[PDB]
């Protein structure tokens, strides 16, 4: 049994891969780690095959972590009822039916036109005002909030409120209770809205979920836990796309490539998803229910195991020159959105948003580039999801 490994929190002002995670990947296909909080240590799969396996083997459960105190990254751990993250079959499957409808390819394709309009409105704004604009605050943050509020079914009279609440994405940590405050309201709002819509025939989430509730498909107690994440999910697109524009803005070569292929940015966008370190460490562990051996390691039942999709995505035996950014990279089977039934509920929704963002920004902000040195862009700290806090930009205007 390899020694336990201390794994601190990252303090790097950039997209660089975690130096301490680089270590463990070299230590062996399975390691034991001690995160900033919680008690004890946990296993960590680092290899692609191992990662893809664990994540899809019924032998490991998520439900059992709620009932414990496995070492984690977050200081606090209070799992809500109904969260897809900690639901196992047949529960994970049940809860999913009350919301997955509005997250399908077809529902995303149906949503695309409206989304493009919202994005274009935010773009008109920065364009009317003139050249110096913080893209994060003016486009990356609000755009995802707005599109998702469409998917969720947020009523008109409450667009501003839910927008403002959700805008508790924080500048980084601009408030401990100041964020609990926003969640407090939002969650009171959601529980109510689900009560209303007891049995409405709506394709939007807040109706489907409502109906399912008033029909015992998913009675209350599971509302917030099921809808909270989705309603707040947009923030994930804000950071990730934030990282992509940063790379584009500081690596002129990539920007070039991206501008040269309108209509064929697919592989480039997938190469960015693979390379970028979306999370700071590892989260959402799994519990080894009935004693198992992983890649030659013995994992006794009851012991927690973390998987690193970031590490997996740099698997030498799966992605040659894994550290190099390709953009044209062949099939590219990255695990950015996870693997299994816990696969990202918003994978497709998030991908369509990323596309509009990259396409609209390159089309409508010519001469786009950092308004200040890269070194001046601060990065989020003490957060699960990595990303730039701002992205000051300039672009051509008038002589």
- Residues that constitute the known binding site for heme: 344
Binder among 184, 298, 324, 397 for a copy of itself (CB under 8 A): 184
Dist. CA 143–CA 147, nearest whole Å:
6
Q: How many CA atoms lie within 13 A of 216 on its CB side?
A: 0
Nearest to 282 by CA among 258, 304, 262, 310: 310
176 lies in the binding site for a copy of itself (CB under 8 A) = no
185 lies in the binding site for ligand HEM (CB under 6 A) = no
Nearest to 40 by CA among 73, 9, 4: 4
242 lies in the binding site for ligand 226 (CB under 6 A) = no
Tokens coding 229: 């994440």
Nearer to ligand 226 (CB atom), residue 37 or residue 110? 37
Nearer to ligand HEM (CB atom), residue 47 or residue 395? 47
78 binds, among ligand 226, a copy of itself, ligand HEM, none (CB under 5 to 8 A by kind): ligand 226
125 lies in the binding site for a copy of itself (CB under 8 A) = yes
181 lies in the binding site for a copy of itself (CB under 8 A) = yes
Q: Where is the binding site for flaviolin, in residues?
A: 80, 187, 278-279
174 lies in the binding site for a copy of itself (CB under 8 A) = no
Binder among 43, 309, 319, 379 for ligand HEM (CB under 6 A): 309
Q: Pairing between strand 369-370 and 392-394?
A: antiparallel
First to last CA, the chain: 68
Dist. CA 284–CA 304, nearest whole Å:
10
68 lies in the binding site for ligand 226 (CB under 6 A) = no
Q: Helices (DSSP H) in 91-141: which residue ranges?
A: 91-97, 105-129, 135
Q: What DSSP designation does 79 have? A: P
Nearer to ligand 226 (CB atom), residue 202 or residue 229? 229
Nearer to a copy of itself (CB atom), residue 125 or residue 320? 125
Dist. CA 131–CA 396, nearest whole Å:
7
From 11-19, 118-126, 342-350, 386-394, give the range in contact with ligand HEM by CB under 6 A.
342-350
Breaks (C-N over 2.5 A) in the chain follow: none
From 63-71, 107-115, 130-138, 343-351, give the range in contact with ligand HEM by CB under 6 A.
343-351
């Amino acid at each position: 049994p390899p020694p336990v490994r201390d794994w601190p929190a990252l303090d790097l002002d950039g997209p660089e891969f975690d130096p301490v995670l680089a270590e463990l990947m070299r230590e062996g296909p399975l390691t034991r780690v001690r995160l900033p909080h919680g008690e004890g240590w946990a296993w960590l799969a680092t290899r692609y095959d191992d990662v893809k396996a664990i994540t899809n083997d019924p032998r490991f459960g998520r439900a059992e972590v709620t009932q414990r105190q496995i070492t984690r990254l977050a200081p606090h751990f209070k799992p809500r009822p109904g969260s897809l993250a900690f639901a196992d079959q047949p529960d994970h499957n049940r809860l999913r039916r009350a919301v997955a409808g509005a997250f399908t390819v077809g529902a995303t394709k149906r949503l695309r036109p409206r989304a493009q309009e919202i994005l274009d409105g935010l773009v008109d704004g920065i364009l009317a005002e003139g050249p110096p604009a913080d893209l994060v605050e003016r486009v990356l943050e609000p755009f995802p909030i707005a599109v998702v509020s469409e998917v969720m079914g947020v009523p008109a009279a409450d667009r501003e409120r839910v927008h403002s609440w959700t805008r508790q994405i924080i500048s980084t940590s601009g408030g401990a209770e100041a964020a609990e405050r926003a969640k407090r309201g939002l969650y009171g709002w959601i529980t109510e809205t689900v009560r209303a819509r007891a049995g409405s025939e709506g394709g939007d989430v807040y109706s489907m979920l409502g109906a399912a509730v008033g029909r015992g498909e998913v009675g209350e107690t599971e509302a917030v836990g099921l809808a909270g994440p989705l309603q707040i999910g947009g923030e994930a697109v804000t950071h990730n796309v934030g990282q992509m524009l940063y790379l584009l803005l500081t690596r002129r070569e990539l920007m070039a490539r991206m501008r040269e292929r309108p209509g064929a940015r697919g592989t480039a966008l997938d190469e960015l998803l693979r390379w970028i370190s979306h999370r700071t460490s590892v989260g959402l562990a799994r519990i080894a229910l009935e004693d198992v051996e992983v890649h030659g390691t013995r994992i006794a039942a009851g012991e927690p195991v973390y998987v690193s999709y970031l590490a997996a995505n740099r698997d030498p035996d799966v992605f040659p020159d894994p550290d190099r950014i390709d953009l044209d990279r062949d099939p590219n089977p990255h695990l950015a959105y996870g693997n299994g039934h816990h696969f990202c509920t918003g994978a497709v929704l998030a991908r369509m948003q990323t596309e509009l963002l990259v396409d609209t920004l390159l089309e409508r902000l010519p001469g786009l580039r950092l308004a200040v040195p890269a070194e001046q862009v601060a990065w989020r700290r003490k957060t699960m999801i990595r990303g730039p806090r701002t992205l000051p930009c300039t672009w051509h205007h008038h002589h």
